[PDB]
Amino acid sequence: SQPDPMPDDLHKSSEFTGTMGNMKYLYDDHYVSATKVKSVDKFLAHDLIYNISDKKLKNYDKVKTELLNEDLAKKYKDEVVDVYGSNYYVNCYFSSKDNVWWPGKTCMYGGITKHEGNHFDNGNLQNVLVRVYENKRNTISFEVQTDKKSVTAQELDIKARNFLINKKNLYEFNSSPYETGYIKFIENNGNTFWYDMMPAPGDKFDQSKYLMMYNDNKTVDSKSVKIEVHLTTK
Amino acid sequence: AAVTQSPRNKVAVTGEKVTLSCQQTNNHNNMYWYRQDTGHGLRLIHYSYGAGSTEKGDIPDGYKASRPSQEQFSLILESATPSQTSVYFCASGGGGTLYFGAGTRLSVL
């Protein structure tokens, strides 16, 4: 398992001076979701393109997802899969040139699980408990739900942040009530890993580079996995 | 027209939530919200480089903004104050072009 964070490993919202609404955006009732799809194209060797239509607005009809490498893309290319992840538009490119708008398209990382045999007997959902710690005190717990036996850390991370934006103002348009935050996952076999929840310091937030951490397409057993969200206040 | 903003005229009471909407039809990458001192210049509140993204201009305080799609950029006064009384201009820009909306006159009494 990955070593837990020391305070110096964690981004601080106090050191970020841009618009925290750009981070909020990525997690606030925001996700690509599709069931039983197969990729239809690609751009580079490490990515897959799906015909998925925006159900909310009409921002896209195609979603490109990038995977860590070409061999991860080959794993899923011809498979019938489900897709769940957080998409972006700024710097969502389908060629080499910077600054190009690609109408009808959106981009994301990872988010792919094989469809067949990954679902529950009926219209049944699996609950995963999230324990939230504020300044080391477990003040709040809740469950997120998934239709999947093997679910990406990304999908659970999203559902957890979405709940917390709505109940605890995790991210707000200008800043956050929190100084640091990380989400740690604890697997059945003792393996743990975590993601920093705050933007890198500075005046700007690159959404694409932030989400790229999902490109490993890390999956967990939704039945046995544990999630802790650890926050400190300003 | 290139950029249409609405409402064109709005009178609001202190503390009401005011939203100004702006829609463009040429689908340029950049959208901007300015307010005009009047007898003076345009001052940048917020702008975006694309859907899902906004950045602070020179005078962001007291305004939020949302770019929910390429064509739409809205300015949000959560709690309207009388200092927010003025004229508001939406702009869209890109590919060596810059277009303006017709202006929103907002008065907060």
Side-chain angles (χ1 to χ4, degrees):
Chain A
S1 85
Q2 160 173 37
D4 267 29
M6 324 163 250
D8 56 286
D9 303 305
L10 292 177
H11 296 160
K12 316 291 168 66
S13 67
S14 59
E15 292 180 358
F16 165 75
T17 39
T19 299
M20 188 73 72
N22 294 330
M23 173 75 85
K24 194 184 187 188
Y25 174 75
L26 295 175
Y27 291 102
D28 183 19
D29 186 37
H30 175 83
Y31 56 88
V32 169
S33 190
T35 288
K36 214 163 47 176
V37 292
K38 190 177 336 164
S39 60
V40 298
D41 208 358
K42 53 215 269 102
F43 165 27
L44 303 166
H46 69 276
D47 79 51
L48 295 171
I49 293 162
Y50 286 86
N51 289 327
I52 297 162
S53 281
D54 190 351
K55 285 310 193 287
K56 283 94 161 292
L57 307 162
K58 266 103 185 83
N59 288 328
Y60 59 84
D61 65 274
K62 282 176 146 52
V63 175
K64 173 170 59 79
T65 180
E66 292 175 75
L67 299 150
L68 186 62
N69 58 48
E70 174 187 44
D71 280 325
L72 204 46
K74 280 179 189 195
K75 185 173 182 184
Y76 297 103
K77 181 181 166 169
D78 292 312
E79 298 304 310
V80 179
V81 300
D82 310 317
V83 169
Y84 196 104
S86 178
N87 58 301
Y88 66 93
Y89 303 92
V90 170
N91 293 317
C92 173
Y93 296 136
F94 295 63
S95 69
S96 280
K97 182 92 198 190
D98 295 67
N99 298 296
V100 181
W101 186 42
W102 293 82
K105 296 186 187 24
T106 190
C107 291
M108 65 174 275
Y109 292 93
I112 310 169
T113 49
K114 224 72 80 169
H115 176 81
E116 327 78 58
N118 202 38
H119 286 277
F120 294 106
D121 37 4
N122 297 289
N124 291 325
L125 300 183
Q126 174 72 57
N127 298 310
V128 180
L129 168 70
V130 183
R131 300 204 270 164
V132 180
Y133 297 75
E134 299 184 269
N135 300 312
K136 284 173 200 282
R137 304 177 180 271
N138 179 200
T139 52
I140 170 164
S141 299
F142 59 102
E143 278 105 29
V144 297
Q145 299 188 298
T146 182
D147 56 354
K148 303 187 179 81
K149 309 179 154 76
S150 190
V151 65
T152 60
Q154 177 177 190
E155 176 172 337
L156 300 179
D157 187 3
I158 296 168
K159 282 160 160 180
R161 295 199 217 186
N162 178 47
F163 195 81
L164 260 5
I165 283 161
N166 294 288
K167 298 278 165 326
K168 309 277 306 175
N169 285 331
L170 170 66
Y171 306 122
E172 301 182 294
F173 178 91
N174 180 57
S175 182
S176 170
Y178 302 102
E179 175 71 336
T180 67
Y182 62 99
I183 177 169
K184 169 181 194 198
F185 288 78
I186 298 99
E187 303 194 79
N188 189 188
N189 66 352
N191 183 65
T192 67
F193 56 96
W194 59 273
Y195 307 134
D196 192 329
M197 300 173 72
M198 294 294 168
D203 175 43
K204 73 284 277 173
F205 185 57
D206 184 349
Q207 295 167 319
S208 177
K209 194 184 197 303
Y210 181 68
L211 298 169
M212 189 180 296
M213 71 180 180
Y214 297 138
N215 70 170
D216 70 353
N217 209 66
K218 173 67 170 165
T219 54
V220 290
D221 182 49
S222 64
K223 189 93 190 151
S224 54
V225 66
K226 293 150 168 177
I227 309 332
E228 310 177 351
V229 176
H230 296 261
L231 314 164
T232 66
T233 56
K234 308 266 259 287
Chain B
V3 172
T4 141
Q5 46 184 106
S6 91
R8 247 277 359 166
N9 291 276
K10 178 79 184 290
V11 171
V13 298
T14 296
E16 92 172 74
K17 170 154 170 182
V18 190
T19 294
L20 313 183
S21 301
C22 174
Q23 60 149 286
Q24 55 151 348
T25 48
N26 296 95
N27 267 306
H28 300 292
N29 293 357
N30 310 325
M31 296 193 66
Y32 304 83
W33 267 112
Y34 289 95
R35 75 182 267 182
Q36 188 179 63
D37 300 4
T38 281
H40 315 99
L42 294 171
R43 292 188 85 167
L44 191 59
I45 309 175
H46 291 298
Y47 64 102
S48 340
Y49 287 152
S53 179
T54 79
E55 299 288 352
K56 294 162 180 164
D58 306 308
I59 49 137
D61 294 329
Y63 296 91
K64 305 170 160 56
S66 172
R67 179 94 176 261
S69 62
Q70 252 253 338
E71 41 274 316
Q72 170 76 210
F73 190 35
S74 67
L75 194 73
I76 296 107
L77 296 64
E78 280 289 335
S79 182
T81 70
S83 63
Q84 294 178 315
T85 294
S86 71
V87 196
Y88 285 90
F89 288 89
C90 186
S92 79
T97 75
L98 184 67
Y99 304 97
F100 285 92
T104 288
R105 302 175 199 189
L106 177 79
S107 44
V108 188
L109 72 188

